[PDB]
RNA sequence: GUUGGGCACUCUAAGGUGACUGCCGGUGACAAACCGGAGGAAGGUGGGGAUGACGUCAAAUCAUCAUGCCCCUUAUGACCUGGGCUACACACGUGCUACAAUGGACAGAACAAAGGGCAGCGAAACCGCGAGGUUAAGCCAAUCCCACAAAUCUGUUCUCAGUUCGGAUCGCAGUCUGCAACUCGACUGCGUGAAGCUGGAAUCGCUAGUAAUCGCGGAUCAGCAUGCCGCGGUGAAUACGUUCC
RNA sequence: AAGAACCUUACCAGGUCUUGACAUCCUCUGACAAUCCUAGAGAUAGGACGUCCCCUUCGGGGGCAGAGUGACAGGUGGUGCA
């Protein structure tokens, strides 16, 4: 829902809030493709599971509001 | 000429505004209401005063190249993140979860 | 015993089969049909319409 | 007193009401004779798709037959006699 | 294939086993019934019971188990009955009753008949013979038709194929004809074999 | 084996003509008899306003000119391929009258159907247009191969 | 007054003739309001026209169910069936027009 | 009906009756039949569904299930998380909406049936452009709620245009459901407005409440319908004939 | 099988458990357990917190769980020319 606000897994948001205590530094691996990219994520590289491997996606400004799985395409086709 | 668009003369105003990119039926309806002018009058039968008022209301809206650019910078933005939707934009495939096997021809 | 309520799915409470289940009876089309025949389903008779 | 009877066989449901009415009339209270209420028709349609689109139909049906029995000018013996009566396993006696 | 004769003749000439109204309790009262009848089978696998009629009355659940061996069913002083009840009392949750009547002439009931043939085929009695005992017993019982079938690897015969010895008439054309039907599976050392047994027992007029 | 009876239509309430009703039912689309009842009563007011005659005088005249007298029927006994001249039964005359009237009225250039149907009736009544031509056409064709029958 | 139940489809018209001037009032409205079609109105009057009782009786119908066509047929049938209570001499003239038959054409 | 009001009618549904060539004309074995009478709601097999025989394809299913013997048996057992099943060069099926005017929009009228509901239906007020949100009436019920129709009829405007035709697609918008709608829901804004100017060769099917057409409800189901199953409304044309297939 | 987001689900990729998910017993019979703290993507974990089985002439047994236990259990892996 949209009254409840944007969604993010609390397991992930904790990991990134620990990095926000320090200066980015570590790179978080997660399976929460469904988590919304908040402003707090900006500057991080997030390792997101695409079904087999973790895709390293650098988080920029325009990526805020989207989900993490928008940047980790699950199906290979050329 | 309204928002840099020669709206047709013979057809009614509401219709003539639908040609203006960024104005549809319901926008044209609440334009002419906000203009305080009859929505049944004709473009050929309007006044230059009434045109001015219509033109003043439409300046508050994003229309034509202003809107075309807004839309185009979004196409930029999605191909500037390699998002699923971005890739679907550049590949010419459906971007909102439509199936491709058949019935995707508008995109293809 | 699923984690969330959504995951919980209707299974044939006799068969165990998780398909085709009739919420009134909690049976798949199969286990029901058979029991309907035998006539162990209080007032559910075969129809002609 | 207002009684609602519900059954899957209208025969036993009629034989019930007969006694419910007769026990109230021997008890002496005036009876509104068993109102037939709109019989409920739950139909269950099990389809087995053949060639995908053709589909062998098999329909089953449950009918709840209903009867309403009002008892006017009720008596102590009536209220008793109603609880005394044994309506069978296929009838639901609601008061 | 064919319509199950019972299937199409319930509430018409034959009756419900499960005699009870219940609205919101339907599934509770139903799946209970399914345990009760599945239990009495596994328990009384040898007592010649078929029509396990189940009535209900809030918490007074009655189970009539019609039995061709009623003296055997009761047990030594209601020994089998009482032990049966307490389990059912502890399983179902209610006051499980045990009214009992007899299946006079076991060869009139098609379940019992098909159960009899179920054992003969396990003990390796020639398909041929197994049926013929029933057929003739059912004739003398007083039945206007019979159609025992056995189908499967018959005698261990590599190729499975069906063998039916049919006497009298099997009037499936007649909705008022009392065609009993009962299937059964015969698990030998070559798979399983199908005991199907029809019995026309005089018209229901 | 025995000729099925044709369905007895009611008379058209304002012209008391079962012919006019049959036209309505011919014009009716998707069981919208209302649309067709309107169209005809609109078309007949158009005929009466133009001509001054009663629409019934014109419509019956229109049908006379559309209604076929002889038709071509394919006969292939051995070889043959004979277009047997067949006399149109009086029911099949009206059939083909109303069919052609409606079929060609729908094809006309005029904007509304009430005008299109009015103009096809007015043209049919003047022994001209397309629906009258169609009758001529099959008669010209029936006259052409008249040596069979 | 002379009562007669009509039924077509799911319509059920409780027709009642009363001494009047040929007014058909269905559920407290003039027939023209309730049934729009003229063709349907003529067909509803068809029993009154053949007995020549149009202008003799006020028809007071109570209808419920089906549509406008359906409602017509039930009224027609119910007028016809009301007239039979008014005068048994009409039976011959009604029966000739097929007005006393109940059209039992249900959906398949 | 809102209420008192026997309850007439209608409806509800238990039990009945009713169609039989029965009766009457002709006809013909004086009979059967046939032709036509009446009476009746029904006429000459009342109309629908239900229920057949012995068949064969060692037809199909060990991905309903079970199954004798194989195999796997720290895995050919099992559990989780993410993903795929929703890919798309294309093909073969099923289907829906358009290709306008007998239409589109605009408003005023309407007239349905069947079915569902308490872990719910939710009135009605209220809030928002809307989808929805608020709180909560009444009611597991012929009692209350969902539904209470749409096609259509009557006002009005556009005027045969790629169009107030058409709706795809995309951009930006919101709202529910769920732990979560990125892949991959539905719905509603708002703009955009593709193809389509009504589908050949060919092929199938259909004799009436049918074809065509317009809505409704329900199962499955948190949500998800251009599918399925009901239900009702409107409602045809044609059947001469057996010449041919 | 036009009611697959998860579940379903069988497939995949990776994580993981191995009387193994469950399953009969064998017995041993405790509590079983809720539980919420910490992890983890979650399973899988360790534990914060939390164990009282009832019936039992109070022996045992019915259980449930864990352990032991044992063949097995269990396979959408084969064979529909078993």
Tab-separated table of N, CA and C (backbone and C1' of nucleotides) in Angstrom, chain E residues 2-3 8 24 159 164 172-173 175 187-192, chain H residues 49-55 58 66-69 118-119 140:
chain	number	residue	atom	x	y	z
E	2	UNK	N	-18.913	-46.053	-17.561
E	2	UNK	CA	-20.268	-46.243	-17.062
E	2	UNK	C	-20.468	-45.365	-15.832
E	3	UNK	N	-21.736	-45.075	-15.539
E	3	UNK	CA	-22.107	-44.372	-14.324
E	3	UNK	C	-22.123	-45.407	-13.207
E	8	UNK	N	-26.140	-42.830	-9.066
E	8	UNK	CA	-27.308	-42.258	-9.700
E	8	UNK	C	-28.617	-42.723	-9.075
E	24	UNK	N	-22.598	-25.098	9.451
E	24	UNK	CA	-21.230	-24.618	9.634
E	24	UNK	C	-20.320	-25.743	10.141
E	159	UNK	N	0.402	-61.249	-18.964
E	159	UNK	CA	-0.558	-60.320	-19.561
E	159	UNK	C	-1.804	-60.273	-18.668
E	164	UNK	N	-15.070	-62.266	-16.306
E	164	UNK	CA	-16.379	-61.997	-15.715
E	164	UNK	C	-17.349	-63.135	-16.026
E	172	UNK	N	-29.161	-51.756	-15.831
E	172	UNK	CA	-28.711	-50.389	-15.555
E	172	UNK	C	-29.612	-49.338	-16.214
E	173	UNK	N	-30.460	-49.773	-17.165
E	173	UNK	CA	-31.382	-48.945	-17.922
E	173	UNK	C	-32.510	-48.443	-17.035
E	175	UNK	N	-33.791	-46.864	-13.603
E	175	UNK	CA	-33.410	-46.061	-12.455
E	175	UNK	C	-33.995	-46.636	-11.170
E	187	UNK	N	-4.516	-57.406	-3.957
E	187	UNK	CA	-3.064	-57.255	-4.049
E	187	UNK	C	-2.391	-58.624	-3.874
E	188	UNK	N	-1.927	-59.205	-4.997
E	188	UNK	CA	-1.124	-60.422	-5.034
E	188	UNK	C	0.325	-60.029	-5.336
E	189	UNK	N	1.167	-61.038	-5.615
E	189	UNK	CA	2.589	-60.854	-5.875
E	189	UNK	C	2.852	-60.449	-7.331
E	190	UNK	N	1.787	-60.242	-8.134
E	190	UNK	CA	1.868	-59.591	-9.428
E	190	UNK	C	0.815	-58.482	-9.444
E	191	UNK	N	1.124	-57.382	-8.744
E	191	UNK	CA	0.357	-56.143	-8.820
E	191	UNK	C	-0.910	-56.179	-7.964
E	192	UNK	N	-2.015	-55.697	-8.564
E	192	UNK	CA	-3.345	-55.761	-7.971
E	192	UNK	C	-4.373	-56.106	-9.049
H	49	G	P	-31.917	-32.168	-24.166
H	49	G	O5'	-31.303	-31.963	-22.701
H	49	G	C5'	-30.529	-33.027	-22.111
H	49	G	C4'	-30.320	-32.737	-20.648
H	49	G	C3'	-29.993	-33.953	-19.776
H	49	G	O3'	-28.586	-34.129	-19.653
H	49	G	C1'	-31.945	-32.930	-18.969
H	50	A	P	-27.922	-35.566	-19.957
H	50	A	O5'	-28.638	-36.486	-18.843
H	50	A	C5'	-28.351	-36.224	-17.450
H	50	A	C4'	-28.906	-37.335	-16.610
H	50	A	C3'	-28.579	-38.735	-17.101
H	50	A	O3'	-27.280	-39.136	-16.670
H	50	A	C1'	-30.889	-38.592	-16.598
H	51	U	P	-26.363	-40.040	-17.626
H	51	U	O5'	-27.156	-41.449	-17.601
H	51	U	C5'	-27.099	-42.265	-16.400
H	51	U	C4'	-28.149	-43.339	-16.468
H	51	U	C3'	-27.988	-44.356	-17.601
H	51	U	O3'	-27.092	-45.391	-17.220
H	51	U	C1'	-30.235	-43.574	-17.489
H	52	G	P	-26.081	-46.015	-18.295
H	52	G	O5'	-27.063	-46.771	-19.337
H	52	G	C5'	-27.096	-46.325	-20.734
H	52	G	C4'	-27.408	-47.483	-21.647
H	52	G	C3'	-26.379	-48.608	-21.724
H	52	G	O3'	-26.640	-49.586	-20.727
H	52	G	C1'	-27.405	-48.106	-23.874
H	53	A	P	-25.601	-50.799	-20.469
H	53	A	O5'	-25.829	-51.778	-21.723
H	53	A	C5'	-24.682	-52.354	-22.391
H	53	A	C4'	-25.124	-53.192	-23.568
H	53	A	C3'	-23.983	-53.894	-24.334
H	53	A	O3'	-23.686	-55.200	-23.851
H	53	A	C1'	-25.269	-52.631	-25.843
H	54	C	P	-22.880	-55.392	-22.477
H	54	C	O5'	-22.315	-56.883	-22.632
H	54	C	C5'	-20.981	-57.097	-23.194
H	54	C	C4'	-21.078	-57.294	-24.685
H	54	C	C3'	-19.791	-57.057	-25.481
H	54	C	O3'	-18.857	-58.126	-25.429
H	54	C	C1'	-21.570	-55.963	-26.549
H	55	G	P	-17.277	-57.828	-25.446
H	55	G	O5'	-17.063	-57.001	-26.810
H	55	G	C5'	-17.201	-55.544	-26.831
H	55	G	C4'	-16.545	-55.031	-28.082
H	55	G	C3'	-15.034	-54.833	-28.019
H	55	G	O3'	-14.366	-56.071	-28.213
H	55	G	C1'	-16.104	-53.039	-29.189
H	58	A	P	-2.595	-51.277	-30.707
H	58	A	O5'	-2.510	-51.545	-29.114
H	58	A	C5'	-1.758	-52.698	-28.643
H	58	A	C4'	-2.051	-52.915	-27.177
H	58	A	C3'	-1.393	-51.933	-26.212
H	58	A	O3'	-2.254	-50.830	-25.971
H	58	A	C1'	-1.484	-54.201	-25.359
H	66	A	P	-0.214	-42.872	-3.567
H	66	A	O5'	-0.846	-44.288	-4.004
H	66	A	C5'	-1.712	-44.972	-3.047
H	66	A	C4'	-2.233	-46.243	-3.672
H	66	A	C3'	-1.181	-47.318	-3.959
H	66	A	O3'	-1.046	-48.204	-2.841
H	66	A	C1'	-2.560	-46.982	-5.873
H	67	U	P	0.263	-49.114	-2.627
H	67	U	O5'	0.485	-49.814	-4.085
H	67	U	C5'	-0.071	-51.145	-4.248
H	67	U	C4'	0.047	-51.588	-5.686
H	67	U	C3'	1.437	-52.044	-6.147
H	67	U	O3'	1.556	-53.456	-6.083
H	67	U	C1'	0.486	-50.479	-7.713
H	68	G	P	2.089	-54.160	-4.738
H	68	G	O5'	2.029	-55.707	-5.177
H	68	G	C5'	3.155	-56.583	-4.921
H	68	G	C4'	3.785	-57.023	-6.214
H	68	G	C3'	5.296	-56.857	-6.305
H	68	G	O3'	5.985	-57.866	-5.574
H	68	G	C1'	4.300	-56.172	-8.338
H	69	C	P	7.378	-57.525	-4.854
H	69	C	O5'	8.342	-57.277	-6.118
H	69	C	C5'	8.738	-58.404	-6.948
H	69	C	C4'	9.318	-57.894	-8.239
H	69	C	C3'	10.578	-57.038	-8.121
H	69	C	O3'	11.746	-57.836	-7.985
H	69	C	C1'	9.029	-55.987	-9.566
H	118	C	P	-20.874	-16.615	6.118
H	118	C	O5'	-19.498	-16.755	6.932
H	118	C	C5'	-18.646	-15.586	7.104
H	118	C	C4'	-18.836	-15.019	8.489
H	118	C	C3'	-19.092	-16.031	9.615
H	118	C	O3'	-17.865	-16.377	10.249
H	118	C	C1'	-20.321	-13.979	9.886
H	119	A	P	-17.216	-17.829	9.978
H	119	A	O5'	-15.687	-17.463	9.658
H	119	A	C5'	-15.329	-17.035	8.312
H	119	A	C4'	-14.851	-15.608	8.344
H	119	A	C3'	-13.430	-15.386	8.895
H	119	A	O3'	-12.618	-14.545	8.066
H	119	A	C1'	-15.028	-14.160	10.186
H	140	C	P	-29.772	-13.627	11.381
H	140	C	O5'	-29.016	-14.278	10.114
H	140	C	C5'	-27.579	-14.513	10.191
H	140	C	C4'	-27.215	-15.566	9.187
H	140	C	C3'	-27.739	-16.970	9.488
H	140	C	O3'	-28.997	-17.144	8.837
H	140	C	C1'	-25.517	-16.970	8.530
